[PDB]
Amino acid sequence: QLVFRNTVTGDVLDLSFGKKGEKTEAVEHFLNTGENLYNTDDEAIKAGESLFMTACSGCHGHHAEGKLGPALGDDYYTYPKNANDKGLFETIYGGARSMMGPQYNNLTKDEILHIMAWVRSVYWGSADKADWLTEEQKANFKPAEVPEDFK
Amino acid sequence: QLVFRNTVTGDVLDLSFGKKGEKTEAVEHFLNTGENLYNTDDEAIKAGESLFMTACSGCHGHHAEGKLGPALGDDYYTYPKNANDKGLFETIYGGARSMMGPQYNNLTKDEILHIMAWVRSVYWGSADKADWLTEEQKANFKPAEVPEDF
Amino acid sequence: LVFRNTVTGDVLDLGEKTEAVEHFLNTGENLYNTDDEAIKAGESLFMTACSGCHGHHAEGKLGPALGDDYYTYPKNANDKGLFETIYGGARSMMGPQYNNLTKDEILHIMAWVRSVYWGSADKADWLTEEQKANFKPAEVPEDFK
Amino acid sequence: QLVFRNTVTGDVLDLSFGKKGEKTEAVEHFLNTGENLYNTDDEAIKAGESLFMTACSGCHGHHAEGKLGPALGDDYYTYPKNANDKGLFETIYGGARSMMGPQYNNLTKDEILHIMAWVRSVYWGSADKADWLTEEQKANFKPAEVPEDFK
Ligand code: HEC
Ligand code: HEC
Ligand code: HEC
Ligand code: HEC
Ligand SMILES: [Ca+2]
Ligand SMILES: [Ca+2]
Ligand SMILES: [Ca+2]
Ligand SMILES: [Ca+2]
Ligand SMILES: [Fe+3]
Ligand SMILES: [Fe+3]
Ligand SMILES: [Fe+3]
Ligand SMILES: [Fe+3]
Ligand code: NA
Ligand code: NA
Ligand code: NA
Ligand code: NA
Ligand code: NA
Ligand code: NA
Ligand code: NA
Ligand code: NA
């Protein structure tokens, strides 16, 4: 019985709100466990890259290096819960401050998990701060390519 | 095909960018004529509403009333060529200045024509400044409700 | 003169007023546009209040470039309009300045903003026709085109 | 030796340019020790308030609650060195990422210390995490109220 909460207000997120897609295995798994099955799925990561460019790149940069909103590929966080997949989904679904609007009406839950897998795949921060990774994944993790513009 | 120019630099746009698919009838007609077939197709306009909310509403508002970027439903334009569909397409595809980046990597040319059709559908400006409309359309054009957001 | 919000069109509520502020409230004309000392002071206030969002050379960053002849709001090509936009704010991040800055400080900023203009004389609606005829555009910032 | 380093790059900060202003007691003392004399000066806190509204509120909110940039009054920091006065000065002076540009051309070093004193005055986090406070101040610490806009 997971309690999903708004990143800014702490209000409960009603996950039945917003754009309905097919009720996929990744979404049912996520609603039960806060684990994103697409983190390891190369096909899903590819589809997440394309959804991030459409929905996110204008504010976060085509390499998640940050532009108007922050870098999403680094181990620095505005909200520390965004280091884990339950928090990241909450921030995307429910929105945060200012121009970071909720995406519940723009994207299905399955599309958000695709985008989330892609955001994790381009990570260039330290394994020690990667809360979404298992101890096994950390031990075997190489930081991805830093974007130039991250300085 | 016509020559499509970048709104900021005046340089020619590469419309062949990407490998998402082959041109739709609407896209091939638009590249030849600058006319957007979706402007009068209610189904195309609804798909464009959803595409606009996902790609554009963060910076231009959920009613195209403006937020970080300008209102798109009014009859003033920062770039007056955006009152016609050729200009509008060039601005979206190629980008403009500051936070208005090019969309050629975010959206297919067909999705952009879907978005443009929805943007024209919500216009609340005068018929006389609506350069994308035909005289038949201008005679029967009634402005959309001005959103209370703006 | 009646002063209106750039976005809503609502009245702006506008004392120990300077000559420039009294002249501005009666005419919509900014005396500081030709006062080199006032343009220097406006540079320092612009860097404090504006450069974070509009850049150190008014080239644009969060908000638009202010030195070019493209406007989001066409009235910002005249000093009455520009004053309304700064005083009363616009959309999103462009908040009202009426509590942060005096009217006199705003006129200093506006004088500096006009001093770094790099667009066309034709679109410079704050210049008289004789100022246009003797127009000397400022350098175009490297981070703009 | 007290060396000031850029929050993003780690490069030594050059303090000889920007808005020169005047060498003040508070600035000389801070460049020698990393201690902000303005922190306990109610007159300086009031001046810092007006400088923050003019220079900072557009991105950080009128109550330092966050808007486009982070909340500054809470006890979570994107960059944990900002919990001390040396780190906070470095981030303000030399900037951070995305839209947090350097402020050394916008403000004198003295103006920055005024803003910093005001930011510490509105702090609503825990005494345990307020590194800039002496242990007298921390044993006597009363956090400011949480502004509504923080949510
Ligand atoms: C501009 C209109 C934006 C779009 C589109 C998206 N984001 Fe965003 N985001 C933006 C800002 C201005 C901020 C800071 C807001 C705040 O409350 O401080 C954000 C924040 C995020 C975060 C938090 C990051 C952290 O360090 O904690 C995440 C994870 C984030 N945004 C993700 C994200 C994704 C995946 C988007 C596409 C669906 C997306 N954002 C769109 C501005 C904008
Ligand atoms: C924030 C990251 C933005 C996103 C996402 C989109 N737009 Fe935008 N747009 C933005 C700004 C800051 C500006 C002004 C730029 C300038 O050079 O003045 C714009 C401008 C436009 C225009 C020009 C309108 C005019 O008056 O001439 C159009 C037609 C426009 N934008 C459309 C648009 C569409 C359809 C988007 C989704 C695909 C979109 N923009 C995204 C900021 C942002
Ligand atoms: C970030 C928090 C900002 C600060 C501080 C200032 N401005 Fe701004 N400005 C900003 C945005 C995001 C926009 C677009 C808003 C909109 O409603 O479309 C603006 C807009 C302006 C304009 C309009 C320009 C036009 O082309 O019509 C002007 C003249 C303007 N801003 C001036 C300005 C001055 C002088 C400031 C210091 C007092 C200032 N702005 C601060 C974002 C931000
Ligand atoms: C908008 C153009 C901004 C203005 C004006 C100011 N700040 Fe800012 N700040 C902004 C963003 C987008 C961020 C996040 C940057 C990042 O690298 O993550 C910041 C960050 C800060 C911080 C870091 C806080 C932390 O948790 O570590 C501080 C201390 C900070 N900003 C202070 C600050 C002050 C005092 C300002 C007025 C002089 C100021 N900022 C202006 C965006 C913007
Ligand atoms: Ca958190
Ligand atoms: Ca034009
Ligand atoms: Ca106007
Ligand atoms: Ca640190
Ligand atoms: Fe980019
Ligand atoms: Fe809205
Ligand atoms: Fe700059
Ligand atoms: Fe505010
Ligand atoms: Na991060
Ligand atoms: Na970050
Ligand atoms: Na328009
Ligand atoms: Na407009
Ligand atoms: Na302009
Ligand atoms: Na402009
Ligand atoms: Na914070
Ligand atoms: Na903090």
Author numbering:
A (entry chain A), D (entry chain B): 33 to 183
B (entry chain D): 33 to 182
C (entry chain C): 34 to 47, 53 to 183
Paper quotes:
It receives an electron from the pyrroloquinoline quinone (PQQ) cofactor of methanol dehydrogenase (MDH) to produce formaldehyde. The two electrons are subsequently transferred from PQQ of MDH to the heme of cytochrome cL through an unknown mechanism, followed by its sequential transfer to CytcH, cytochrome c oxidase, and finally to ATP synthase in the cell membrane for the generation of ATP molecules.
The crystal contains four Ma-CytcL molecules in the asymmetric unit (ASU), in which the active sites (heme-binding pocket) from each subunit face each other. Although it appears to be a tetramer in the asymmetric unit, Ma-CytcL likely functions as a monomer in the cell. Each monomer of Ma-CytcL contains a heme cofactor covalently bound to the heme-binding region and coordinated by a metal ion, Fe(III) in heme. However, Ma-CytcL contains two Na+ ions (1Na+ and 2Na+) mainly surrounded by the loop between α3 and η2, in which a few residues form coordination bonds with the heme molecule.
